[PDB]
Amino acid sequence: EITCDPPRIPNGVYRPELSKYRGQDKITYECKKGFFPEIRGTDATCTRDGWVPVPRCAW
Amino acid sequence: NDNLEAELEQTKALCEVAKQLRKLPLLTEERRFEAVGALEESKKAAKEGKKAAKRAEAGAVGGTSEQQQAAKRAREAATVAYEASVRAEAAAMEVKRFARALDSFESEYESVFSGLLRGAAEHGGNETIKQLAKECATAVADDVTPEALTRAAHNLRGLYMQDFAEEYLQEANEAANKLEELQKATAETVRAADAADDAKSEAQEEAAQFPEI
């Protein structure tokens, strides 16, 4: 009965866009031209500790 | 779910936009080729018109009044052909300029929309959503009109609350205007190429009575 709020990814775009996500629900994200992700992958799963790994678009 | 209906509506919007962005560079290249062709034809009409004016002027030396009027007419057509070639230079320069603008736009977003679809292909909520995104991997739109570009941008912006979708709409609106101006500039090069041909022909007809060099 784990739930997540939509991820907050400044300078990036995630999919799908839903009001609420359930445990093990995966989002995929892309960064704006000029920005690159913190991790190699563009995946994030809804867990007890939020979105894992944390989605971040860096310059 | 209605969550699956949402995600399917969203995946379709990404797919529509991605297909237009892959078509834009192919479209700009056809326009760039067309402008180059139109310009070179206007330069061939001007070169030929100049030759005719020279054949008429040499021919009318010590000629009658209804022979000297011909050279004056072939000279005026040779300059009209030249002036139209100059207008085709300026119009083709605009084609290259709007094509460049549209190419920067496609470059800014194509890899983003393609990556979002790749994510939906691998991790889509349904096998329908994964199937739609997998089919859209290399798909290209049949055409791109300024109205199709903005419609798909407004559709995306209505489905995605993320700032990215709003910034895409703002940019797609600028690109729809640049695409409209790319088509006006292509028509202007073609119009001037036709204008130069008509003048070349008027110079060649008046010079028909005189000897070639």
Numbering used by the authors:
A (entry chain B): 264 to 322
B (entry chain A): 25 to 237
Provide excerpts from the study.
In this work, we describe the identification and characterization of a Trypanosoma brucei FH receptor (FHR). FH blocks the complement cascade by accelerating the decay of C3 convertase (C3bBb), thus reducing C3b production, and by acting as a co-factor for factor I, which cleaves and inactivates C3b4. FH is composed of 20 tandem complement control protein (CCP) domains with 6, 7 and 20 binding self-cell-negative surface markers, whereas 1–4 and 19 bind C3b5–8. Here we have identified and characterized FHR, a receptor that binds FH in a manner that would enable FH to negatively regulate C3b and C3bBb preventing MAC formation.
